[PDB]
Structure formats: structure tokens, C-alpha cells
Amino acid sequence: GYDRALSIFSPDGHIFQVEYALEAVKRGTCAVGVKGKNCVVLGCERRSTLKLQDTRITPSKVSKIDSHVVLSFSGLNADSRILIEKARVEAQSHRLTLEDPVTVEYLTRYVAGVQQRYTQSGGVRPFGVSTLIAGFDPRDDEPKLYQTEPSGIYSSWSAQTIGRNSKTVREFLEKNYDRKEPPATVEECVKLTVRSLLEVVQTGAKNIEITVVKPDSDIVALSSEEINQYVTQIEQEKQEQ
Template identity: 50%
Template sequence: MERYDRAITIFSPDGHLFQVEYAQEAVKKGSTAIGVRGKDCVVIGVEKKSIPTLQDDRTIRKIHSIDEHVMLAFAGLSADARVLVDYARIECQSYKLTLEDPVTVGTIARYVANMKQRFTQSPGRRPFGISMLIGGFDYDGTPRLFKTEPSGTYYEYFANSTGRGEKPVREYLEEHYSDETTKDEAAVLKLVIKALSQVVQSGAQNIEIAVMTANNERESHCSHRVLSVEEVENLLKEVDDERVAAESEEGKKK
């Protein structure tokens, strides 16, 4: 085996860092995650895999709150995510103590991306096998959504996905994302449910959704909540009823 296939700091003859590409493969095997930025909200949804009967599902979280105004979801290795989540939380608090302002979403996305990038340059380490969707609000009330990769790259998006179902979910978002489907929280929730339904077929128990909205009346200026299973079930039923009605209307036209 050639050294460039084992060492993180050596490029292959055709310009690849194979260990980084292997980390990306770990992401592709992870649960699907989706993030959508609306006009006044950010919604993140994830696919929850089935767990052993005796395992407490409260110990399995794919969506994490980083600060009062920032949350993230990930696909890939959960242990790697736990480390980065802890670092991100510390950075949020350090930023607030130093500058007396809440950290911007772009700043924390860049911080996470920089940490990932450092682990692609140092011998004796390996890249983080996770991709993250980081969403929230800046202190001026602007919703933001970023995606970071194992290589350390990061970009801002209106909507995106990651994980094993990234391609079909992203294609659905590209086709259906519009001002109409993101006009308010209810519309964004439906868009996220419909997109996740492209890869999740087993109901509300396998979907987790978190919503963050701007709230100028509170000191934190943001409110964050995770939807209950009952709320997800109601959304799925509403979306299914709309689909049946649309198919019925289409049948009448024929």
C-alpha cells in the first residue's frame, strides 16, 4: 500500500487526500439531515435510525443547541460530532465573554470548519468523519444556514442536506424551494417533512425536527423547540392528505 493511502499529510499523484475522502464516505453512511432557511425561521430535520429495544432514545441526539440562537445537525460519526459540539459551545461562550455580543452563525461555522481543516494537515490525527448543518440567527434577526465538510470547507445555503439521503433530498429541495414554500414556519415545516419523506418511510418515530424562530420580545431574541412525535405525526398526515387530494384532482382532469 502506498504511503499516500495511509498518511493524512501526503497527496496522491493525482492530487487526492484519500483519508479526507474516506471521511466523506463515513458521512455518506450517516443518517440524513436537512436544513432550510425561511423568512423568519430556520428548520432542521434529521432521520432517526431504529435503536435497540432496551436503549433510551433520549441519549441519541442528532440535533444540538450550540447557543440560544444557534443549532446544528450532523451526519457521520456521532463520537466525532460530540467533540466538535463541545468545542463549538465553548467558542460561543468565549466569544460572548470577550466581545459582549452573541457569536454570529457565520463565525461559529468558520470556527468548526477551521478545526476540521487543521485535522487534515497534522500527522498522527485523522479527519473528522462528519458533515454539519449549522443554522440560527444573527443578532440583527437574519436567519443563516451553513454546511461544513470533513475537508474543512464551508458554504452558506438557503437549504441543503447531508448524509446517506443527501442527493434525493437536495434534488427535492432544488425543485420545490421558493418564496411560497418558505413564507412562514408552517410552510417550511411542510417542505422539510416532504423532503425527508423522500428517504424516510417509517413514520414520525424516525424523524426529529427542530425549529428556531426570531423573537424580539425575549432577551435572547430567539426561541428554539424540538417537535414532539405527535406534532410530526400531524404534519405527516397533513402532507399525506394534501398528496391524496392532489392525486384525486389530477385524476379528475384526466
């Protein structure tokens, strides 16, 4: 079998293959997640190089892992499917042996473990994927948001973004998100998600997709018109000044 050590140390202490896996994430379309008082909202951007896609059948950037946890990503699309499939199998296995759905913290810990494993096994390159994992623990009503990266490191966030121009939108979220008082409503939480994406995306109804996860497996993907109403309302706020 092919066992060549592809992920190795360099004189200055870097694993260059893990390093370059982040460069692929930087290339990937932007993804964002913000948690409210009683909700979490995941926002993603669509590429508009090709103006002739079929949106019914194209795999949307937000995947369900179980009925109560969702995962979005930035990076190589093909790699993300592999992580999603493994997470979905693990979710069913956890329900089988523990007789309880996964906690977001647990599912994150698993996905991060898979990514870490691919950084010190022979014959593999790391995943060129960072994930945003969001949802609600069973019986719990407290919002959970986590991020994993190609290195295998995971951590929770009040708000986070990954992908292209994520530096610009993180800069936005750092001054616009008040930890003292998180967005109290689902409405105002979606408002903040669109505002931060509009810094990167450009005037587009499509180009921005939103998914809202509420406690007890209540996950809904917003239509073009619903998102477009937020876009039409946000743009009219600037003109006042």
C-alpha cells in the same frame, strides 16, 4: 509523540483520508435544513434497526451551541461531540472577549477551521462529520444556514441536506424551494422539511425529528404528535390525484 503524516496527497491530487471521511458522512443518517422568511428548520432521521431505545436519555441529533445557534450533523457520532464541545467553548469565549454572542458565520468559520486543521496535522485523521449550522445573529432577524464538511470548506445555503440518500432529497429541494418566495410561515417551512425527509425515511412518526429556531433565542423541539400531524396531512395530499 505520534506525528505520522496520515493525510497526504496521492498522484492524482486527492487527499484520500479526507476523501474517505466523506464516505463516513454518506453512511451517516440523513440531516436537512431549510430557511424561511423569519425561521430556520432542522430535520433529522432516526435509525429503526433497534426498536427498543430510550429517547429521554439518547443524545438527540440537534445540539445547541449557544442559545441562538444550533448544530446538526451527519457521520460518526463520536466525532461530532468533539466538534460540538469545541464550538460551545468558543461560543462562551467569544462572549467573554467581544461582549457579544457569535454570528452564525463566525461559529461556522471556527468549526470549519478545526476540521481543516485535522487534515494537515501529523498523527490525526480528519473528522468523519459534516455539519449543518443554523440560527440568528444577535439583534438580527435574518435567517442563517451554513454547512461544513471534513475538508474544512464552509458555505451558506438556502436549503441543504447531508448524509445517506442526500442526493435524492437535494434533488427534491432543488425543484421545490423557490428562492423568490421562501416559506413565509413557520408552519409551511416545517411542511417542506418533512416532505423532503419522507422521500428517504419511510412511514414513521418517530424516524423524523424537527427543531425550529426563531430569532432572539427562540428554539423549540417538536413532539412526536406534532410531527405526526404533518405526516398525516402530507400523505393525504398524494391520494387526491
